[PDB]
Amino acid sequence: TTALVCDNGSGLVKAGFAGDDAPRAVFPSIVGRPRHQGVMVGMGQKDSYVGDEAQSKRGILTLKYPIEHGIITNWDDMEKIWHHTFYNELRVAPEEHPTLLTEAPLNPKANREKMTQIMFETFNVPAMYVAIQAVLSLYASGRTTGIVLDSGDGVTHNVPIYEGYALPHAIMRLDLAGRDLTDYLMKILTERGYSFVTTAEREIVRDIKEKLCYVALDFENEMATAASSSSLEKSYELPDGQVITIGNERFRCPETLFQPSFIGMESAGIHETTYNSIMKCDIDIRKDLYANNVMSGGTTMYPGIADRMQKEITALAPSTMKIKIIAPPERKYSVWIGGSILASLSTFQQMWITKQEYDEAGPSIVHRKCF
Amino acid sequence: TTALVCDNGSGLVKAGFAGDDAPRAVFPSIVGRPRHQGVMVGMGQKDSYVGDEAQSKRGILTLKYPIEHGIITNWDDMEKIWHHTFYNELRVAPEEHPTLLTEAPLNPKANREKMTQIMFETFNVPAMYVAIQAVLSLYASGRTTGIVLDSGDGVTHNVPIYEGYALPHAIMRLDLAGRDLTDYLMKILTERGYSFVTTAEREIVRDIKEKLCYVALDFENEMATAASSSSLEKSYELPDGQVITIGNERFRCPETLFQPSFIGMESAGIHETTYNSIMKCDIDIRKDLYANNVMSGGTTMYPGIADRMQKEITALAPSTMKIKIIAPPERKYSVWIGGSILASLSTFQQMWITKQEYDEAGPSIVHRKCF
């Protein structure tokens, strides 16, 4: 039976059959529960809404994400998201389809175990696997060597790879991603009085972030230009038709990826953690990592982020190195496309966790087989 | 059928058919095994790299040399290097081609026996021989009389010869060569903070040694000049484009050949062991040994080493003796060229160990026929 790829990343579920070019179900990983009284009988008024259901009802629901910083915090709602993914969106019974899950690296083993328990005992799936998202992102880019920079909704991580052979000591994970960008955008939009505080408004500021924001090529000079002229201002129309206008916030928001101290995050920026990840690698392979920076995940979609990243690493890296960034179109779906490759690859059919192996070895099996 | 010459010296294999002017396969005597977790699929089916392939993957491999101090320590990997030499580089089936091996003198008879066993029982070769490397080095020069100084990657040895008739009591072997020079160069490059510790870095310091180092003509005055001026400093570019700069290390490294006490080696230097080898010879022939010092092996390639050696022996030897050193170009390949001569010499076709003699006499035969 055709394999199944289900990228339970943060923020958006991407799911679909293996061998397809793009995920046929993309929807937000949200569970919403009615906030108000139940005044009007004659309707199901059903207890919970997920995905586009929850977006269509946004302003009466307390939206929650059950996966936070790539960690599933709320298994009772995540099991609802998986149920919705399989039965309502893909409209398929998982007990026929081996499911390739994926997760971020450097992540609590309790998560990988509970995902295993849920897949094998709730959904009875014939087989399962849990690939690292960055490893998939090489398959989607046809590479076999490179640093991968994945930057999602909840986590950002760097994984250098060389003809295979991921260097596990050089992996880095940042816990800074699109939610921290949304919350900082809300904090700075407060500076001119667009008070957004509800989760519905958080979900609108996510749209403002996606539509308007871009990464400045030269932040000090862009800040001075936005101070001196309105040319960088853009107008956006809220769901109720109230117009808002946005200026230096437009690039101050995604700049926090390069200057995490703006959100009080202590860590080095994403250019610095990319360089430090290459610096953890053996000195022979660094030239091919510089020649093969792969960018993936939705928060790499900002206009100009590849140019800024190339400028910053060319300032960090030795002057001779041909710093190159592979940031293609559809890099938002590259983790799913990589899973669609891997799950359909003929050599990978050895790699599945079979249900017989789970019945023999319990949740502990998924630390032995999967990387 | 045309004979086959395979100089399994240390560090580099030189191999090729007899009668050729130069070895058509030269590659490092390295076996490399993956150091890291192989995450992608499309690897790991091949799990051991040999020669130039191990250099092409240097930064992910635990490189190892299976021949150490001219002694084969690791027959399981040496048999891989021979397999690679015959089937992948020369692309020839050894069971048709009699193979001239060679080894250093004063070397454990267990090695010569295991080489015999492997050649006759793994490769089924029709015939075999194991010439002394220094005896081969005469043929490439055309001498019949001389000191030979062979200085390889793993061993250095002196063999005096006169119209034939190698003097076995006057042979000397030093166990000091290019690996000890590489490791001392690493130790002194630590003095200004280029920390090289991996075998990949050992393999880069071998390149630094080959590119930059030279032998000082007057070590005290060169050391004082490098202390007083930067004119002797040279800059080199690492594989990742990091520039390093090197100074008195440039000649302090190969100086350890003349002053082994720098690496704590007790012995007399190579000039002193050359003189003491001539002093073990009968007093009539010494004048022709002084007139016929032949230098061979890669660590004799340093610029100025012939001038320094001539100065030092002219200081050691009696004032009348016309000290002359035959250190030609291609003396790096002179042992192979000497084997290419000897294996194609019509007088030598009596000398092969035939497989019938091995079936009659076992490994012990190679002590009876070969010198």
């Binding site: 046809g142 496309i337 490759i341 690859l345 | 690897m43 091949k46």
Partner: peptide, 21 residues
């Protein structure tokens, strides 16, 4: 490089598997 199908990309990794073999 432009977008290319998973049907194309898979055969690149099968070829690389044969190259590693």
């Amino acid at each position: 490089a432009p977008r290319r199908s998973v049907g194309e990309l898979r055969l690149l990794f099968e070829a690389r598997a044969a190259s590693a073999a």
